[PDB]
């Protein structure tokens, strides 16, 4: 099934920029306090750091999908992250919402069910891969909750 996995990874990386900006924008429009003074996305420096973290997390999750194993994500990205976010004051509940939106996006691209962009595949089923990538995204929340 390895060709399907390569397609699934390609579908994510090819839309990775739009995924990150739309997820972090979504987290904000649901909780606009994040943008008020004292909010953790207030100022360009913070919004850039948050966008950066979105991308990093997606980058790790895409490796895990390309490897068929969560270790790279857990070892290199998730280990330490909860403590870091606590120490920084990065809200972990808002982080988990950003990640959940990227989960919905990746499931859509993998199964070619995005509303705004179709890509090109031979007919078949990728539900296992979509369920797998979901489990990687869910490990993020699990780590930082």
């Amino acid at each position: 099934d390895g060709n399907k996995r390569l397609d699934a990874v390609n579908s994510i990386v090819s839309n990775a920029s739009c995924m990150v900006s739309d997820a972090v924008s979504g987290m904000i429009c649901e909780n606009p306090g994040l943008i008020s003074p004292g909010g953790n996305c207030y100022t360009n420096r913070r919004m850039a750091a948050c966008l950066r973290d979105g991308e990093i997390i997606l980058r790790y999750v895409s490796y895990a999908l390309l490897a068929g194993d969560a270790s790279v994500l857990e070892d290199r990205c998730l280990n330490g992250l909860k403590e870091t976010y606590i120490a920084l004051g990065v809200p972990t509940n808002s982080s988990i919402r950003a990640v959940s939106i990227m989960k919905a996006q990746a499931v859509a691209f993998i199964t070619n069910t995005a509303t705004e962009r179709k890509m090109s595949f031979a007919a078949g089923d990728c539900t296992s891969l979509a369920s797998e990538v979901a489990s990687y995204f869910d490990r993020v929340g699990a780590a930082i909750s």
């Binding site: 990874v9 990386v13 991308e55 990093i56 980058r59 790790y60 390309l66 290199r76």
Partner: peptide, 27 residues
């Protein structure tokens, strides 16, 4: 370790022939 890095994978097709899959370094 560094998440900004690219990724390179090597697939054997036959002895002395490979398919190369790349993820570019982050912008």
């Amino acid at each position: 370790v560094n998440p900004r890095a690219g990724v390179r994978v090597r697939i054997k097709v036959v002895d002395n022939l490979y398919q190369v899959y790349e993820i570019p370094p982050m912008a």
